[PDB]
PDB file of C-alpha atoms and ligand atoms in Angstrom:
ATOM      1  CA  UNK L 192       2.853  67.717  -0.110  1.00 16.07           C
ATOM      2  CA  UNK L 193       4.456  64.282  -0.184  1.00 14.68           C
ATOM      3  CA  UNK L 194       3.754  60.749  -1.375  1.00 15.72           C
ATOM      4  CA  UNK L 195       4.798  57.620   0.530  1.00 15.41           C
ATOM      5  CA  UNK L 196       4.760  53.986  -0.551  1.00 17.99           C
ATOM      6  CA  UNK L 197       5.154  50.728   1.345  1.00 17.09           C
ATOM      7  CA  UNK L 198       7.354  48.669  -0.994  1.00 15.23           C
ATOM      8  CA  UNK L 199       7.234  44.917  -0.343  1.00 17.20           C
ATOM      9  CA  UNK L 200       9.297  42.086  -1.739  1.00 15.47           C
ATOM     10  CA  UNK L 201       7.091  39.010  -1.430  1.00 16.17           C
ATOM     11  CA  UNK L 202       7.362  35.305  -2.109  1.00 14.16           C
ATOM     12  CA  UNK L 203       5.577  32.036  -1.468  1.00 17.73           C
ATOM     13  CA  UNK L 204       6.456  29.545   1.223  1.00 17.61           C
ATOM     14  CA  UNK L 205       6.469  25.857   0.291  1.00 16.86           C
ATOM     15  CA  UNK L 206       2.913  25.488   1.616  1.00 15.98           C
ATOM     16  CA  UNK L 207       1.776  28.241  -0.711  1.00 17.47           C
ATOM     17  CA  UNK L 208       1.193  30.939   1.878  1.00 16.35           C
ATOM     18  CA  UNK L 209       2.529  34.319   0.937  1.00 12.51           C
ATOM     19  CA  UNK L 210       5.346  36.045   2.825  1.00 13.23           C
ATOM     20  CA  UNK L 211       7.107  39.360   2.658  1.00 15.03           C
ATOM     21  CA  UNK L 212      10.839  39.219   3.226  1.00 16.03           C
ATOM     22  CA  UNK L 213      11.827  42.769   2.265  1.00 14.75           C
ATOM     23  CA  UNK L 214      10.074  45.861   3.671  1.00 15.35           C
ATOM     24  CA  UNK L 215      10.903  49.363   2.479  1.00 15.22           C
ATOM     25  CA  UNK L 216       9.201  52.731   2.716  1.00 18.06           C
ATOM     26  CA  UNK L 217       9.849  55.362   0.057  1.00 16.62           C
ATOM     27  CA  UNK L 218       8.808  58.989   0.459  1.00 14.33           C
ATOM     28  CA  UNK L 219       9.029  61.706  -2.199  1.00 17.57           C
ATOM     29  CA  UNK L 220       8.657  65.359  -1.167  1.00 16.77           C
ATOM     30  CA  UNK L 221       7.207  67.322  -4.079  1.00 18.50           C
ATOM     31  CA  UNK L 222       8.021  70.735  -2.581  1.00 15.35           C
ATOM     32  CA  UNK L 223      11.660  70.174  -1.593  1.00 15.28           C
ATOM     33  CA  UNK L 224      12.177  67.612  -4.411  1.00 16.12           C
ATOM     34  CA  UNK L 225      13.722  65.187  -1.888  1.00 16.63           C
ATOM     35  CA  UNK L 226      13.423  61.400  -1.987  1.00 16.88           C
ATOM     36  CA  UNK L 227      14.066  59.253   1.096  1.00 17.78           C
ATOM     37  CA  UNK L 228      13.986  55.507   1.673  1.00 18.90           C
ATOM     38  CA  UNK L 229      13.905  53.390   4.811  1.00 19.92           C
ATOM     39  CA  UNK L 230      14.455  49.663   5.205  1.00 19.29           C
ATOM     40  CA  UNK L 231      12.519  48.014   8.023  1.00 15.65           C
ATOM     41  CA  UNK L 232      14.048  44.714   9.044  1.00 16.15           C
ATOM     42  CA  UNK L 233      11.549  41.872   8.684  1.00 20.66           C
ATOM     43  CA  UNK L 234      12.528  40.262  12.036  1.00 19.17           C
ATOM     44  CA  UNK L 235      11.582  43.266  14.227  1.00 19.88           C
ATOM     45  CA  UNK L 236       9.511  41.974  17.153  1.00 19.73           C
ATOM     46  CA  UNK L 237       6.322  44.047  16.949  1.00 18.42           C
ATOM     47  CA  UNK L 238       2.856  44.271  18.505  1.00 20.05           C
ATOM     48  CA  UNK L 239       0.496  43.238  15.684  1.00 20.45           C
ATOM     49  CA  UNK L 240      -2.927  44.706  16.608  1.00 21.44           C
ATOM     50  CA  UNK L 241      -5.202  41.799  17.434  1.00 16.99           C
ATOM     51  CA  UNK L 242      -2.427  39.197  17.386  1.00 15.24           C
ATOM     52  CA  UNK L 243       0.231  40.035  19.980  1.00 16.02           C
ATOM     53  CA  UNK L 244       3.972  40.365  19.577  1.00 21.42           C
ATOM     54  CA  UNK L 245       5.471  38.699  16.481  1.00 22.50           C
ATOM     55  CA  UNK L 246       7.974  39.326  13.751  1.00 21.21           C
ATOM     56  CA  UNK L 247       6.623  42.336  11.931  1.00 24.82           C
ATOM     57  CA  UNK L 248       6.411  40.696   8.523  1.00 23.31           C
ATOM     58  CA  UNK L 249       3.664  38.403   9.844  1.00 23.38           C
ATOM     59  CA  UNK L 250       1.332  41.401   9.618  1.00 25.74           C
ATOM     60  CA  UNK L 251       1.398  41.141   5.816  1.00 22.98           C
ATOM     61  CA  UNK L 252       0.743  37.408   5.779  1.00 21.91           C
ATOM     62  CA  UNK L 253      -2.287  37.973   8.021  1.00 23.83           C
ATOM     63  CA  UNK L 254      -3.841  41.155   6.706  1.00 21.53           C
ATOM     64  CA  UNK L 255      -1.763  42.308   3.786  1.00 24.71           C
ATOM     65  CA  UNK L 256      -0.361  45.790   3.278  1.00 23.32           C
ATOM     66  CA  UNK L 257      -3.167  47.315   5.328  1.00 20.93           C
ATOM     67  CA  UNK L 258      -2.315  45.405   8.511  1.00 18.79           C
ATOM     68  CA  UNK L 259       1.407  45.853   7.951  1.00 20.66           C
ATOM     69  CA  UNK L 260       0.787  49.595   7.601  1.00 19.89           C
ATOM     70  CA  UNK L 261      -1.205  49.689  10.848  1.00 19.04           C
ATOM     71  CA  UNK L 262       1.545  47.672  12.542  1.00 19.78           C
ATOM     72  CA  UNK L 263       4.266  50.059  11.315  1.00 17.11           C
ATOM     73  CA  UNK L 264       2.231  53.044  12.474  1.00 16.64           C
ATOM     74  CA  UNK L 265       1.527  51.654  15.948  1.00 15.66           C
ATOM     75  CA  UNK L 266       5.100  50.465  16.552  1.00 17.95           C
ATOM     76  CA  UNK L 267       7.232  52.949  14.602  1.00 19.28           C
ATOM     77  CA  UNK L 268       4.970  55.841  13.576  1.00 23.24           C
ATOM     78  CA  UNK L 269       5.557  54.781   9.947  1.00 21.63           C
ATOM     79  CA  UNK L 270       2.262  55.266   8.065  1.00 23.53           C
ATOM     80  CA  UNK L 271       2.717  54.998   4.277  1.00 24.26           C
ATOM     81  CA  UNK L 272      -0.228  55.953   2.062  1.00 25.43           C
ATOM     82  CA  UNK L 273       0.218  53.427  -0.768  1.00 26.41           C
ATOM     83  CA  UNK L 274       1.729  50.017  -1.331  1.00 26.91           C
ATOM     84  CA  UNK L 275       3.599  48.129  -4.025  1.00 25.27           C
ATOM     85  CA  UNK L 276       4.143  44.367  -3.745  1.00 24.08           C
ATOM     86  CA  UNK L 277       6.444  42.410  -6.069  1.00 25.90           C
ATOM     87  CA  UNK L 278       7.267  38.694  -6.155  1.00 23.49           C
ATOM     88  CA  UNK L 279      10.240  36.850  -7.667  1.00 21.54           C
ATOM     89  CA  UNK L 280       8.944  36.495 -11.216  1.00 20.54           C
ATOM     90  CA  UNK L 281       7.502  40.003 -11.286  1.00 22.12           C
ATOM     91  CA  UNK L 282      10.790  41.482 -10.100  1.00 24.20           C
ATOM     92  CA  UNK L 283      12.880  39.549 -12.639  1.00 24.65           C
ATOM     93  CA  UNK L 284      10.602  40.380 -15.569  1.00 26.84           C
ATOM     94  CA  UNK L 285      10.307  44.033 -14.533  1.00 27.21           C
ATOM     95  CA  UNK L 286      14.101  44.516 -14.456  1.00 30.42           C
ATOM     96  CA  UNK L 287      14.581  42.811 -17.818  1.00 30.61           C
ATOM     97  CA  UNK L 288      11.923  44.956 -19.479  1.00 31.98           C
ATOM     98  CA  UNK L 289      13.145  48.212 -17.932  1.00 32.23           C
ATOM     99  CA  UNK L 290      16.864  47.474 -18.399  1.00 34.88           C
ATOM    100  CA  UNK L 291      17.438  44.859 -21.139  1.00 34.20           C
ATOM    101  CA  UNK L 292      21.140  45.806 -21.175  1.00 36.68           C
ATOM    102  CA  UNK L 293      21.336  44.702 -17.500  1.00 35.77           C
ATOM    103  CA  UNK L 294      21.868  46.619 -14.265  1.00 33.71           C
ATOM    104  CA  UNK L 295      25.435  47.708 -13.463  1.00 34.49           C
ATOM    105  CA  UNK L 296      26.118  46.508  -9.917  1.00 32.06           C
ATOM    106  CA  UNK L 297      29.385  46.592  -7.983  1.00 34.74           C
ATOM    107  CA  UNK L 298      28.948  43.102  -6.553  1.00 34.73           C
ATOM    108  CA  UNK L 299      30.322  43.119  -2.991  1.00 35.91           C
ATOM    109  CA  UNK L 300      31.745  39.594  -3.129  1.00 35.57           C
ATOM    110  CA  UNK L 301      31.353  36.255  -4.835  1.00 36.94           C
ATOM    111  CA  UNK L 302      28.112  34.632  -3.689  1.00 36.93           C
ATOM    112  CA  UNK L 303      25.912  31.734  -4.774  1.00 33.17           C
ATOM    113  CA  UNK L 304      24.691  29.886  -1.676  1.00 36.24           C
ATOM    114  CA  UNK L 305      20.872  29.511  -1.798  1.00 37.70           C
ATOM    115  CA  UNK L 306      20.274  32.164  -4.500  1.00 36.68           C
ATOM    116  CA  UNK L 307      20.150  29.936  -7.595  1.00 39.80           C
ATOM    117  CA  UNK L 308      22.764  32.028  -9.446  1.00 39.11           C
ATOM    118  CA  UNK L 309      26.541  32.415  -9.252  1.00 40.55           C
ATOM    119  CA  UNK L 310      27.691  36.009  -8.855  1.00 37.83           C
ATOM    120  CA  UNK L 311      31.259  37.266  -9.114  1.00 36.74           C
ATOM    121  CA  UNK L 312      32.686  40.171  -7.143  1.00 38.17           C
ATOM    122  CA  UNK L 313      33.087  43.505  -8.877  1.00 40.48           C
ATOM    123  CA  UNK L 314      31.352  45.600 -11.490  1.00 39.83           C
ATOM    124  CA  UNK L 315      28.961  43.515 -13.593  1.00 38.09           C
ATOM    125  CA  UNK L 316      25.707  44.005 -15.468  1.00 37.33           C
ATOM    126  CA  UNK L 317      23.114  41.708 -13.871  1.00 36.19           C
ATOM    127  CA  UNK L 318      19.846  40.566 -15.417  1.00 35.39           C
ATOM    128  CA  UNK L 319      16.653  40.212 -13.379  1.00 36.31           C
ATOM    129  CA  UNK L 320      17.434  36.715 -12.095  1.00 36.61           C
ATOM    130  CA  UNK L 321      20.928  37.723 -10.979  1.00 35.19           C
ATOM    131  CA  UNK L 322      19.891  41.030  -9.391  1.00 34.97           C
ATOM    132  CA  UNK L 323      17.200  39.144  -7.471  1.00 36.34           C
ATOM    133  CA  UNK L 324      19.870  36.692  -6.342  1.00 37.66           C
ATOM    134  CA  UNK L 325      21.982  39.642  -5.190  1.00 41.21           C
ATOM    135  CA  UNK L 326      19.049  41.033  -3.212  1.00 44.44           C
ATOM    136  CA  UNK L 327      18.361  37.631  -1.618  1.00 42.27           C
ATOM    137  CA  UNK L 328      21.837  36.529  -0.475  1.00 43.05           C
ATOM    138  CA  UNK L 329      22.259  36.269   3.279  1.00 38.90           C
ATOM    139  CA  UNK L 330      24.345  33.116   3.932  1.00 36.27           C
ATOM    140  CA  UNK L 331      27.249  34.812   5.692  1.00 37.65           C
ATOM    141  CA  UNK L 332      27.754  36.030   9.306  1.00 37.17           C
ATOM    142  CA  UNK L 333      26.001  39.344   8.520  1.00 35.14           C
ATOM    143  CA  UNK L 334      22.678  37.663   7.698  1.00 38.71           C
ATOM    144  CA  UNK L 335      19.763  40.017   7.161  1.00 38.16           C
ATOM    145  CA  UNK L 336      21.924  43.005   8.076  1.00 37.40           C
ATOM    146  CA  UNK L 337      24.135  42.576   5.017  1.00 38.55           C
ATOM    147  CA  UNK L 338      21.114  41.855   2.827  1.00 42.66           C
ATOM    148  CA  UNK L 339      19.508  45.177   3.798  1.00 43.47           C
ATOM    149  CA  UNK L 340      22.728  46.941   2.834  1.00 45.87           C
ATOM    150  CA  UNK L 341      22.809  45.196  -0.550  1.00 44.80           C
ATOM    151  CA  UNK L 342      19.092  45.849  -1.141  1.00 42.11           C
ATOM    152  CA  UNK L 343      19.636  49.552  -0.529  1.00 45.22           C
ATOM    153  CA  UNK L 344      22.582  49.371  -2.945  1.00 46.65           C
ATOM    154  CA  UNK L 345      20.229  47.889  -5.584  1.00 45.88           C
ATOM    155  CA  UNK L 346      17.649  50.624  -5.012  1.00 45.00           C
ATOM    156  CA  UNK L 347      20.301  53.335  -5.295  1.00 43.94           C
ATOM    157  CA  UNK L 348      21.548  51.755  -8.517  1.00 42.58           C
ATOM    158  CA  UNK L 349      18.045  51.532  -9.985  1.00 41.72           C
ATOM    159  CA  UNK L 350      17.640  55.185  -8.976  1.00 42.93           C
ATOM    160  CA  UNK L 351      20.870  56.285 -10.664  1.00 41.95           C
ATOM    161  CA  UNK L 352      20.166  54.178 -13.752  1.00 39.40           C
ATOM    162  CA  UNK L 353      16.498  55.084 -14.265  1.00 39.13           C
ATOM    163  CA  UNK L 354      16.199  58.773 -13.343  1.00 35.19           C
ATOM    164  CA  UNK L 355      17.238  60.384 -16.628  1.00 31.21           C
ATOM    165  CA  UNK L 356      15.604  62.018 -19.610  1.00 35.04           C
ATOM    166  CA  UNK L 357      15.784  58.820 -21.680  1.00 35.23           C
ATOM    167  CA  UNK L 358      13.514  57.105 -19.121  1.00 34.07           C
ATOM    168  CA  UNK L 359      11.338  60.104 -18.187  1.00 33.01           C
ATOM    169  CA  UNK L 360      10.645  60.470 -21.914  1.00 29.77           C
ATOM    170  CA  UNK L 361       9.553  56.808 -21.686  1.00 29.57           C
ATOM    171  CA  UNK L 362       7.450  57.196 -18.521  1.00 29.59           C
ATOM    172  CA  UNK L 363       4.197  55.833 -20.085  1.00 30.45           C
ATOM    173  CA  UNK L 364       5.998  52.643 -21.108  1.00 35.13           C
ATOM    174  CA  UNK L 365       7.814  52.389 -17.759  1.00 30.74           C
ATOM    175  CA  UNK L 366       4.506  52.796 -15.917  1.00 29.95           C
ATOM    176  CA  UNK L 367       2.819  50.106 -18.014  1.00 29.40           C
ATOM    177  CA  UNK L 368       5.673  47.699 -17.289  1.00 29.33           C
ATOM    178  CA  UNK L 369       5.374  48.428 -13.558  1.00 29.10           C
ATOM    179  CA  UNK L 370       1.601  47.941 -13.337  1.00 29.59           C
ATOM    180  CA  UNK L 371       1.883  44.630 -15.178  1.00 30.70           C
ATOM    181  CA  UNK L 372       4.391  43.144 -12.711  1.00 27.80           C
ATOM    182  CA  UNK L 373       3.797  45.138  -9.489  1.00 28.56           C
ATOM    183  CA  UNK L 374       0.653  44.863  -7.352  1.00 32.00           C
ATOM    184  CA  UNK L 375       0.025  48.443  -6.267  1.00 30.35           C
ATOM    185  CA  UNK L 376      -2.754  50.828  -5.265  1.00 28.44           C
ATOM    186  CA  UNK L 377      -0.959  53.993  -6.429  1.00 27.45           C
ATOM    187  CA  UNK L 378      -3.150  55.997  -8.837  1.00 27.84           C
ATOM    188  CA  UNK L 379      -1.401  55.903 -12.205  1.00 26.00           C
ATOM    189  CA  UNK L 380      -1.305  59.696 -12.300  1.00 26.42           C
ATOM    190  CA  UNK L 381       0.824  59.342  -9.167  1.00 23.94           C
ATOM    191  CA  UNK L 382       3.418  57.150 -10.840  1.00 24.90           C
ATOM    192  CA  UNK L 383       3.590  59.758 -13.623  1.00 26.42           C
ATOM    193  CA  UNK L 384       3.836  62.776 -11.304  1.00 28.98           C
ATOM    194  CA  UNK L 385       6.487  61.222  -9.062  1.00 29.99           C
ATOM    195  CA  UNK L 386       8.566  60.147 -12.056  1.00 33.33           C
ATOM    196  CA  UNK L 387       8.205  63.545 -13.720  1.00 31.01           C
ATOM    197  CA  UNK L 388       8.997  65.631 -10.638  1.00 29.93           C
ATOM    198  CA  UNK L 389      11.857  63.467  -9.380  1.00 29.49           C
ATOM    199  CA  UNK L 390      13.264  62.704 -12.835  1.00 28.28           C
ATOM    200  CA  UNK L 391      13.517  66.350 -13.927  1.00 30.39           C
ATOM    201  CA  UNK L 392      13.744  68.439 -10.746  1.00 26.25           C
ATOM    202  CA  UNK L 393      14.581  66.064  -7.883  1.00 24.05           C
ATOM    203  CA  UNK L 394      17.693  65.972  -5.728  1.00 22.59           C
ATOM    204  CA  UNK L 395      19.957  63.146  -6.880  1.00 26.80           C
ATOM    205  CA  UNK L 396      21.101  62.238  -3.352  1.00 24.23           C
ATOM    206  CA  UNK L 397      18.537  59.788  -1.954  1.00 22.40           C
ATOM    207  CA  UNK L 398      19.124  59.468   1.775  1.00 23.79           C
ATOM    208  CA  UNK L 399      18.439  56.135   3.444  1.00 20.12           C
ATOM    209  CA  UNK L 400      17.744  54.807   6.923  1.00 18.16           C
ATOM    210  CA  UNK L 401      17.840  51.266   8.301  1.00 18.73           C
ATOM    211  CA  UNK L 402      15.451  50.354  11.143  1.00 19.63           C
ATOM    212  CA  UNK L 403      16.364  49.339  13.798  1.00 20.15           C
ATOM    213  CA  UNK L 404      19.208  51.847  14.160  1.00 21.01           C
ATOM    214  CA  UNK L 405      22.590  50.905  15.591  1.00 22.21           C
ATOM    215  CA  UNK L 406      22.687  50.136  19.341  1.00 22.46           C
ATOM    216  CA  UNK L 407      18.881  50.092  19.687  1.00 24.21           C
ATOM    217  CA  UNK L 408      18.144  46.357  19.485  1.00 19.65           C
ATOM    218  CA  UNK L 409      19.182  42.858  20.464  1.00 18.08           C
ATOM    219  CA  UNK L 410      18.482  39.434  19.004  1.00 18.12           C
ATOM    220  CA  UNK L 411      16.222  37.294  21.167  1.00 21.49           C
ATOM    221  CA  UNK L 412      14.841  33.772  20.919  1.00 19.93           C
ATOM    222  CA  UNK L 413      11.042  33.803  20.844  1.00 19.68           C
ATOM    223  CA  UNK L 414       8.405  31.196  21.683  1.00 20.19           C
ATOM    224  CA  UNK L 415       6.907  30.624  18.234  1.00 18.98           C
ATOM    225  CA  UNK L 416       8.788  33.085  15.995  1.00 20.01           C
ATOM    226  CA  UNK L 417      12.393  32.020  16.670  1.00 22.72           C
ATOM    227  CA  UNK L 418      15.160  34.550  15.983  1.00 26.95           C
ATOM    228  CA  UNK L 419      13.797  38.091  16.259  1.00 26.60           C
ATOM    229  CA  UNK L 420      15.001  41.641  16.883  1.00 28.26           C
ATOM    230  CA  UNK L 421      13.874  43.199  20.161  1.00 27.74           C
ATOM    231  CA  UNK L 422      14.154  46.948  19.582  1.00 27.71           C
ATOM    232  CA  UNK L 423      13.714  50.163  21.528  1.00 27.35           C
ATOM    233  CA  UNK L 424      10.635  51.406  19.679  1.00 30.08           C
ATOM    234  CA  UNK L 425      10.778  54.917  21.120  1.00 29.00           C
ATOM    235  CA  UNK L 426      14.426  55.442  20.135  1.00 30.33           C
ATOM    236  CA  UNK L 427      13.638  54.199  16.631  1.00 27.70           C
ATOM    237  CA  UNK L 428      10.460  56.333  16.397  1.00 30.60           C
ATOM    238  CA  UNK L 429      12.549  59.426  17.124  1.00 28.67           C
ATOM    239  CA  UNK L 430      15.265  58.493  14.625  1.00 29.45           C
ATOM    240  CA  UNK L 431      12.601  57.925  11.972  1.00 29.92           C
ATOM    241  CA  UNK L 432      10.963  61.270  12.714  1.00 28.97           C
ATOM    242  CA  UNK L 433      14.358  63.006  12.588  1.00 31.45           C
ATOM    243  CA  UNK L 434      15.257  61.286   9.318  1.00 31.79           C
ATOM    244  CA  UNK L 435      12.008  62.146   7.543  1.00 36.82           C
ATOM    245  CA  UNK L 436      11.706  65.836   8.467  1.00 36.76           C
ATOM    246  CA  UNK L 437      15.160  67.309   7.737  1.00 38.37           C
ATOM    247  CA  UNK L 438      17.109  66.170   4.659  1.00 38.63           C
TER     248      UNK L 438
HETATM  249  C1  LIG E 253      18.597  33.319   0.069  1.00 38.87           C
HETATM  250  C2  LIG E 253      18.595  32.392   1.302  1.00 38.87           C
HETATM  251  O1  LIG E 253      19.746  32.281   2.082  1.00 38.87           O
HETATM  252  N1  LIG E 253      17.566  31.736   1.605  1.00 38.87           N
HETATM  253  C3  LIG E 253      17.557  30.853   2.776  1.00 38.87           C
HETATM  254  C4  LIG E 253      16.931  31.616   3.938  1.00 38.87           C
HETATM  255  O2  LIG E 253      15.623  31.973   3.540  1.00 38.87           O
HETATM  256  P1  LIG E 253      15.178  33.572   3.464  1.00 38.87           P
HETATM  257  O3  LIG E 253      16.159  34.407   4.247  1.00 38.87           O
HETATM  258  O4  LIG E 253      13.787  33.754   4.030  1.00 38.87           O
HETATM  259  O5  LIG E 253      15.199  34.095   1.884  1.00 38.87           O
HETATM  260  P2  LIG E 253      14.277  33.353   0.716  1.00 38.87           P
HETATM  261  O6  LIG E 253      15.083  32.251   0.078  1.00 38.87           O
HETATM  262  O7  LIG E 253      13.057  32.790   1.398  1.00 38.87           O
HETATM  263  O8  LIG E 253      13.849  34.528  -0.393  1.00 38.87           O
HETATM  264  C5  LIG E 253      13.101  35.651   0.074  1.00 38.87           C
HETATM  265  C6  LIG E 253      14.141  36.737   0.413  1.00 38.87           C
HETATM  266  C7  LIG E 253      13.936  38.007   0.032  1.00 38.87           C
HETATM  267  C8  LIG E 253      14.974  39.084   0.373  1.00 38.87           C
HETATM  268  C9  LIG E 253      12.657  38.377  -0.742  1.00 38.87           C
HETATM  269  C10 LIG E 253      13.015  39.168  -2.020  1.00 38.87           C
HETATM  270  C11 LIG E 253      11.817  39.398  -2.986  1.00 38.87           C
HETATM  271  C12 LIG E 253      11.977  40.341  -3.946  1.00 38.87           C
HETATM  272  C13 LIG E 253      10.871  40.647  -4.943  1.00 38.87           C
HETATM  273  C14 LIG E 253      13.317  41.119  -4.023  1.00 38.87           C
HETATM  274  C15 LIG E 253      13.289  42.542  -3.368  1.00 38.87           C
HETATM  275  C16 LIG E 253      14.393  43.407  -4.022  1.00 38.87           C
HETATM  276  C17 LIG E 253      14.812  44.596  -3.532  1.00 38.87           C
HETATM  277  C18 LIG E 253      15.899  45.372  -4.272  1.00 38.87           C
HETATM  278  C19 LIG E 253      14.205  45.216  -2.258  1.00 38.87           C
HETATM  279  C20 LIG E 253      13.198  46.321  -2.673  1.00 38.87           C
HETATM  280  C21 LIG E 253      11.919  45.667  -3.185  1.00 38.87           C
HETATM  281  C22 LIG E 253      11.441  45.902  -4.416  1.00 38.87           C
HETATM  282  C23 LIG E 253      10.166  45.213  -4.835  1.00 38.87           C
HETATM  283  C24 LIG E 253      12.126  46.865  -5.406  1.00 38.87           C
HETATM  284  C25 LIG E 253      11.053  47.534  -6.327  1.00 38.87           C
HETATM  285  C26 LIG E 253      11.669  48.388  -7.451  1.00 38.87           C
HETATM  286  C27 LIG E 253      10.898  48.930  -8.407  1.00 38.87           C
HETATM  287  C28 LIG E 253      11.544  49.774  -9.508  1.00 38.87           C
HETATM  288  C29 LIG E 253       9.385  48.718  -8.408  1.00 38.87           C
HETATM  289  C30 LIG E 253       8.642  49.895  -7.756  1.00 38.87           C
HETATM  290  C31 LIG E 253       7.193  50.064  -8.248  1.00 38.87           C
HETATM  291  C32 LIG E 253       6.454  51.099  -7.852  1.00 38.87           C
HETATM  292  C33 LIG E 253       5.023  51.233  -8.361  1.00 38.87           C
HETATM  293  C34 LIG E 253       7.018  52.145  -6.891  1.00 38.87           C
HETATM  294  C35 LIG E 253       7.859  53.208  -7.600  1.00 38.87           C
HETATM  295  C36 LIG E 253       8.098  54.503  -6.807  1.00 38.87           C
HETATM  296  C37 LIG E 253       9.190  54.703  -6.085  1.00 38.87           C
HETATM  297  C38 LIG E 253       9.306  56.043  -5.369  1.00 38.87           C
HETATM  298  C39 LIG E 253      10.296  53.618  -5.962  1.00 38.87           C
HETATM  299  C40 LIG E 253      11.610  54.046  -5.297  1.00 38.87           C
HETATM  300  C41 LIG E 253      12.487  54.897  -6.227  1.00 38.87           C
HETATM  301  C42 LIG E 253      13.540  54.441  -6.882  1.00 38.87           C
HETATM  302  C43 LIG E 253      14.295  55.404  -7.780  1.00 38.87           C
HETATM  303  C44 LIG E 253      14.001  52.996  -6.779  1.00 38.87           C
HETATM  304  O9  LIG E 253      16.803  30.780   5.126  1.00 38.87           O
HETATM  305  C45 LIG E 253      16.025  29.571   4.858  1.00 38.87           C
HETATM  306  C46 LIG E 253      16.041  28.692   6.099  1.00 38.87           C
HETATM  307  O10 LIG E 253      17.203  29.019   6.807  1.00 38.87           O
HETATM  308  C47 LIG E 253      16.562  28.771   3.670  1.00 38.87           C
HETATM  309  O11 LIG E 253      15.647  27.751   3.361  1.00 38.87           O
HETATM  310  C48 LIG E 253      16.829  29.607   2.481  1.00 38.87           C
HETATM  311  O12 LIG E 253      17.549  28.846   1.543  1.00 38.87           O
END
């Protein structure tokens, strides 16, 4: 009695090949009315069926959401039903259409390196370009680990700012905006049902999990992939199973 979605932030390399640099899984439980989200770090060193051990986000470049799903299932027991892929322009335009007033974000610190915008610490309303910049920043010692934290902060803010009667009343519009800028195989009745159930009768606390979990991984230098995360898959499989079954 649940729905699960593989949510991908994607972009183009200079050579034009597509890449995913943010991997999340969202599950909504229709019975218990509980929503959960997990971030899967893109640098996890994973067995990609057919291709050997590589950074897990290479599965998407090779075989799209289907191969990334199979790779998540084999390596982490994560097997989402649906997918939703968004690129830079889609993300920016989606935010600006959903929230023209801007998204209220407690910006962790001043940041501007490599994100094409200049953000100031503290509570600010960010447009699509700025919120994307906030989700992309990584040029500090925390690297991808701090980016995952800030991406989860963005998702929690979008949650708090969009689940309300003013938006659930506007679910048809919201859904049309999403399908125009998000590449997804969810049936549109499913966007409606999830929004209706969660927006009216869902628990407001959305619990989150970051994979790999603390003290289960190290950074290793790889032959052709470079900097990657070598993780204890079995320890992470058990944490994921524990996280997803009991609120
Ligand atoms: C910034 C930097 O330092 N860059 C340097 C660095 O490169 P890099 O690390 O790879 O980053 P890039 O620049 O390549 O950008 C790519 C980086 C990233 C993080 C890709 C980001 C792409 C995006 C589209 C942003 C993703 C944003 C977030 C918040 C993560 C979550 C993803 C998405 C798509 C959020 C989606 C939200 C929605 C409302 C749409 C959902 C649509 C649906 C149909 C599903 C709806 C149902 C649900 C249940 C949703 C969940 C529920 C709620 C309430 C939110 O290193 C190089 C060499 O060293 C340097 O050249 C370079 O300068």
